[PDB]
Design a protein around this motif. Structure first.
Motif, PDB file in Angstrom:
ATOM      1  N   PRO A   1       2.685 -10.718  91.729  1.00  0.00           N
ATOM      2  CA  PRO A   1       2.638 -10.352  92.784  1.00  0.00           C
ATOM      3  C   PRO A   1       2.574  -9.284  93.183  1.00  0.00           C
ATOM      4  O   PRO A   1       2.691  -8.257  92.924  1.00  0.00           O
ATOM      5  N   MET A   2       1.355  -8.579  94.575  1.00  0.00           N
ATOM      6  CA  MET A   2       1.917  -7.436  95.299  1.00  0.00           C
ATOM      7  C   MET A   2       3.431  -6.840  95.152  1.00  0.00           C
ATOM      8  O   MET A   2       4.137  -8.231  95.888  1.00  0.00           O
ATOM      9  N   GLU A   3       3.494  -6.123  95.556  1.00  0.00           N
ATOM     10  CA  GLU A   3       4.953  -5.343  95.428  1.00  0.00           C
ATOM     11  C   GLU A   3       4.691  -4.790  97.039  1.00  0.00           C
ATOM     12  O   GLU A   3       3.730  -4.215  97.400  1.00  0.00           O
ATOM     13  N   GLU A   4       5.869  -4.542  97.844  1.00  0.00           N
ATOM     14  CA  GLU A   4       5.871  -4.043  99.246  1.00  0.00           C
ATOM     15  C   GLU A   4       6.426  -2.897  99.198  1.00  0.00           C
ATOM     16  O   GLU A   4       8.364  -3.189  99.280  1.00  0.00           O
ATOM     17  N   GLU A   5       6.684  -1.712  99.696  1.00  0.00           N
ATOM     18  CA  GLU A   5       7.981  -1.032 100.073  1.00  0.00           C
ATOM     19  C   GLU A   5       7.330   0.059 100.862  1.00  0.00           C
ATOM     20  O   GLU A   5       6.538   0.402 101.380  1.00  0.00           O
ATOM     21  N   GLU A   6       8.401   0.353 101.371  1.00  0.00           N
ATOM     22  CA  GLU A   6       9.101   0.506 102.896  1.00  0.00           C
ATOM     23  C   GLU A   6       8.896   2.429 102.552  1.00  0.00           C
ATOM     24  O   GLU A   6       9.963   3.265 101.943  1.00  0.00           O
ATOM     25  N   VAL A   7       8.232   3.345 103.566  1.00  0.00           N
ATOM     26  CA  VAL A   7       8.289   4.702 103.721  1.00  0.00           C
ATOM     27  C   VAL A   7       8.425   5.074 104.797  1.00  0.00           C
ATOM     28  O   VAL A   7       8.267   4.354 106.154  1.00  0.00           O
ATOM     29  N   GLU A   8       9.688   5.855 105.068  1.00  0.00           N
ATOM     30  CA  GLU A   8       9.778   7.154 106.384  1.00  0.00           C
ATOM     31  C   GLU A   8       9.113   7.832 106.355  1.00  0.00           C
ATOM     32  O   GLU A   8       9.360   9.086 105.451  1.00  0.00           O
ATOM     33  N   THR A   9       8.057   8.536 106.857  1.00  0.00           N
ATOM     34  CA  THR A   9       8.034   9.552 107.407  1.00  0.00           C
ATOM     35  C   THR A   9       8.694  10.633 107.989  1.00  0.00           C
ATOM     36  O   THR A   9       9.325  10.661 109.420  1.00  0.00           O
ATOM     37  N   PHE A  10       9.475  11.871 108.280  1.00  0.00           N
ATOM     38  CA  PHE A  10       9.996  12.812 109.119  1.00  0.00           C
ATOM     39  C   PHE A  10       9.468  14.273 109.159  1.00  0.00           C
ATOM     40  O   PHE A  10       9.073  15.055 108.418  1.00  0.00           O
ATOM     41  N   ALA A  11       9.705  14.468 109.912  1.00  0.00           N
ATOM     42  CA  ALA A  11       9.235  15.806 110.652  1.00  0.00           C
ATOM     43  C   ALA A  11      10.324  16.974 110.291  1.00  0.00           C
ATOM     44  O   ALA A  11      11.143  16.847 110.505  1.00  0.00           O
ATOM     45  N   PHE A  12      10.350  17.910 109.420  1.00  0.00           N
ATOM     46  CA  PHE A  12      10.709  19.177 109.281  1.00  0.00           C
ATOM     47  C   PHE A  12      11.156  20.080 110.902  1.00  0.00           C
ATOM     48  O   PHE A  12      10.225  19.773 112.084  1.00  0.00           O
ATOM     49  N   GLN A  13      12.302  20.242 110.691  1.00  0.00           N
ATOM     50  CA  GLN A  13      12.977  20.953 112.433  1.00  0.00           C
ATOM     51  C   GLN A  13      11.622  22.036 112.022  1.00  0.00           C
ATOM     52  O   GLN A  13      11.743  22.717 110.419  1.00  0.00           O
ATOM     53  N   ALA A  14      11.722  22.916 113.116  1.00  0.00           N
ATOM     54  CA  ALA A  14      10.319  23.337 113.511  1.00  0.00           C
ATOM     55  C   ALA A  14      10.652  24.747 113.210  1.00  0.00           C
ATOM     56  O   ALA A  14       9.474  25.577 112.050  1.00  0.00           O
ATOM     57  N   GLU A  15      12.047  25.405 112.772  1.00  0.00           N
ATOM     58  CA  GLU A  15      12.227  27.042 112.596  1.00  0.00           C
ATOM     59  C   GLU A  15      12.369  26.643 110.885  1.00  0.00           C
ATOM     60  O   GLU A  15      11.669  27.357 109.734  1.00  0.00           O
ATOM     61  N   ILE A  16      13.066  25.908 110.000  1.00  0.00           N
ATOM     62  CA  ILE A  16      12.401  25.039 108.460  1.00  0.00           C
ATOM     63  C   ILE A  16      11.135  25.414 108.230  1.00  0.00           C
ATOM     64  O   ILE A  16      10.869  25.437 107.290  1.00  0.00           O
ATOM     65  N   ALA A  17      10.341  24.353 109.090  1.00  0.00           N
ATOM     66  CA  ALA A  17       8.735  24.358 109.236  1.00  0.00           C
ATOM     67  C   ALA A  17       8.426  25.295 108.816  1.00  0.00           C
ATOM     68  O   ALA A  17       7.173  26.336 108.444  1.00  0.00           O
ATOM     69  N   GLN A  18       8.733  26.591 109.779  1.00  0.00           N
ATOM     70  CA  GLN A  18       7.743  27.559 110.265  1.00  0.00           C
ATOM     71  C   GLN A  18       8.068  28.431 109.032  1.00  0.00           C
ATOM     72  O   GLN A  18       7.875  29.086 108.411  1.00  0.00           O
ATOM     73  N   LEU A  19       9.640  28.759 108.056  1.00  0.00           N
ATOM     74  CA  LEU A  19      10.498  29.302 106.554  1.00  0.00           C
ATOM     75  C   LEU A  19       9.469  29.223 105.490  1.00  0.00           C
ATOM     76  O   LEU A  19       8.968  30.042 104.696  1.00  0.00           O
ATOM     77  N   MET A  20       8.979  27.739 105.982  1.00  0.00           N
ATOM     78  CA  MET A  20       7.923  26.872 104.355  1.00  0.00           C
ATOM     79  C   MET A  20       7.065  28.069 104.555  1.00  0.00           C
ATOM     80  O   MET A  20       6.470  28.062 102.953  1.00  0.00           O
ATOM     81  N   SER A  21       6.212  27.369 105.733  1.00  0.00           N
ATOM     82  CA  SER A  21       4.993  28.061 105.988  1.00  0.00           C
ATOM     83  C   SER A  21       5.137  29.685 105.570  1.00  0.00           C
ATOM     84  O   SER A  21       4.446  30.199 104.150  1.00  0.00           O
ATOM     85  N   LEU A  22       6.249  30.287 105.684  1.00  0.00           N
ATOM     86  CA  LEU A  22       6.336  32.042 105.143  1.00  0.00           C
ATOM     87  C   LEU A  22       7.003  32.011 103.795  1.00  0.00           C
ATOM     88  O   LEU A  22       5.964  32.650 102.826  1.00  0.00           O
ATOM     89  N   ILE A  23       6.713  31.120 103.111  1.00  0.00           N
ATOM     90  CA  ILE A  23       7.751  31.067 101.832  1.00  0.00           C
ATOM     91  C   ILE A  23       6.191  30.858 100.897  1.00  0.00           C
ATOM     92  O   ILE A  23       5.956  31.437  99.900  1.00  0.00           O
ATOM     93  N   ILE A  24       5.944  29.662 101.173  1.00  0.00           N
ATOM     94  CA  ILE A  24       3.811  29.583 100.747  1.00  0.00           C
ATOM     95  C   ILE A  24       2.923  30.174 100.725  1.00  0.00           C
ATOM     96  O   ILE A  24       2.237  30.854 100.105  1.00  0.00           O
ATOM     97  N   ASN A  25       2.805  30.694 102.327  1.00  0.00           N
ATOM     98  CA  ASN A  25       1.585  31.863 102.387  1.00  0.00           C
ATOM     99  C   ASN A  25       1.777  33.545 102.254  1.00  0.00           C
ATOM    100  O   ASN A  25       0.668  33.552 102.669  1.00  0.00           O
ATOM    101  N   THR A  26       3.040  33.919 101.789  1.00  0.00           N
ATOM    102  CA  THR A  26       3.098  35.413 101.897  1.00  0.00           C
ATOM    103  C   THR A  26       3.363  35.403  99.785  1.00  0.00           C
ATOM    104  O   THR A  26       3.695  34.656  99.612  1.00  0.00           O
ATOM    105  N   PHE A  27       3.157  36.683 100.147  1.00  0.00           N
ATOM    106  CA  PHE A  27       3.397  36.936  98.301  1.00  0.00           C
ATOM    107  C   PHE A  27       4.814  37.435  97.953  1.00  0.00           C
ATOM    108  O   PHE A  27       4.833  38.701  98.718  1.00  0.00           O
ATOM    109  N   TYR A  28       5.537  37.043  97.599  1.00  0.00           N
ATOM    110  CA  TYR A  28       6.288  37.784  96.717  1.00  0.00           C
ATOM    111  C   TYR A  28       6.604  38.045  95.160  1.00  0.00           C
ATOM    112  O   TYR A  28       6.668  36.902  94.205  1.00  0.00           O
ATOM    113  N   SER A  29       7.562  38.859  95.600  1.00  0.00           N
ATOM    114  CA  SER A  29       7.754  39.016  93.500  1.00  0.00           C
ATOM    115  C   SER A  29       8.932  38.476  93.770  1.00  0.00           C
ATOM    116  O   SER A  29       9.771  38.027  94.899  1.00  0.00           O
ATOM    117  N   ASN A  30       9.403  38.380  92.000  1.00  0.00           N
ATOM    118  CA  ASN A  30      11.353  37.737  92.198  1.00  0.00           C
ATOM    119  C   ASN A  30      11.364  36.132  92.431  1.00  0.00           C
ATOM    120  O   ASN A  30      12.337  35.796  92.754  1.00  0.00           O
TER     121      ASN A  30
END
Ligand SMILES: Nc1ncnc2c1ncn2[C@@H]1O[C@H](COP(=O)(O)OP(=O)(O)O)[C@@H](O)[C@H]1O
Ligand SMILES: [Mg+2]
Length: 215
Positions: A1-30
């Motif tokens: 029997p097919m299983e059913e699972e609920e998912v909830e999608t959330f938006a990051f808070q706006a500055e956390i989303a800006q920080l994640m983009s900065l972390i991913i799209n910029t070169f860092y050493s270390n």
């Protein structure tokens, strides 16, 4: 029997989303400091259950051993950090891993824009996001005494999901599964993991074990 699972999608808070983009799209050493940040989180979570258990020993029914395991998997290119700390309830997971604003986020972005080393991130109360230096997707599985086992996941881009986890039960704690970027596979190597634990995580007050699949 097919299983059913609920998912909830959330938006990051706006500055956390800006920080994640900065972390991913910029070169860092270390970049290796990601592992220090995740071990620090595990240490903090171990402290919490250890103290809670003083008030209420039955809080250790879900397991008495307080420790950290590191599990590189070269087949699916993941590095997993597992602890037996306090874990997160569903609300803890939604509030602490992306929806609520962090007072340090804007200061830290300004510091990075001015040339700060990425190592400074933990001091700003946003150390978890260092996982995106090395991971294209992060999955967090967590179990708190109060609650069911949940899975959080994000590939960045502004959103994360939360679902009840139907995978293997954990007794209590958190597992952070890093799906590594193709150029960051050095962090699957036992020598490299030992090197960065010794350099950056030498004073943590719980045993850590590295599990290595026989070649
Ligand atoms: N392994 C963990 N176990 C329990 N909670 C955690 C874990 N990792 C992160 N968290 C939760 O996520 C929050 C954010 O972590 P982080 O960004 O490193 O900030 P900080 O450690 O400075 O609070 C932590 O305060 C904690 O509530
Ligand atoms: Mg932290």
């Amino acid at each position: 029997p097919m299983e059913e699972e609920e998912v909830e999608t959330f938006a990051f808070q706006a500055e956390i989303a800006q920080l994640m983009s900065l972390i991913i799209n910029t070169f860092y050493s270390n970049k290796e400091i990601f592992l220090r940040e995740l071990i620090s989180n595990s240490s903090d979570a171990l402290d919490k259950i250890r103290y809670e258990s003083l008030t209420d020993p039955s809080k250790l029914d879900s397991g008495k051993e307080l420790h950290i395991n590191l599990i590189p998997n070269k087949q699916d290119r993941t590095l997993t950090i597992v602890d037996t700390g306090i874990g997160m309830t569903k609300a803890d997971l939604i509030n602490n891993l992306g929806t609520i604003a962090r007072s340090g986020t804007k200061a830290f972005m300004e510091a990075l824009q001015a040339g700060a080393d990425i190592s400074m991130i933990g001091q700003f109360g946003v150390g978890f996001y260092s996982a995106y230096l090395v991971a294209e997707k992060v999955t967090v599985i967590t179990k708190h005494n109060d609650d069911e086992q949940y899975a959080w996941e994000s590939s960045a881009g502004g959103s994360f999901t939360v679902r009840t986890d139907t995978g293997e039960p954990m007794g209590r704690g958190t597992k952070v599964i890093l799906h590594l970027k193709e150029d960051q596979t050095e962090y699957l190597e036992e020598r490299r993991i030992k090197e960065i634990v010794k350099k950056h995580s030498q004073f943590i007050g719980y045993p850590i074990t590295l599990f290595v699949e026989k070649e």
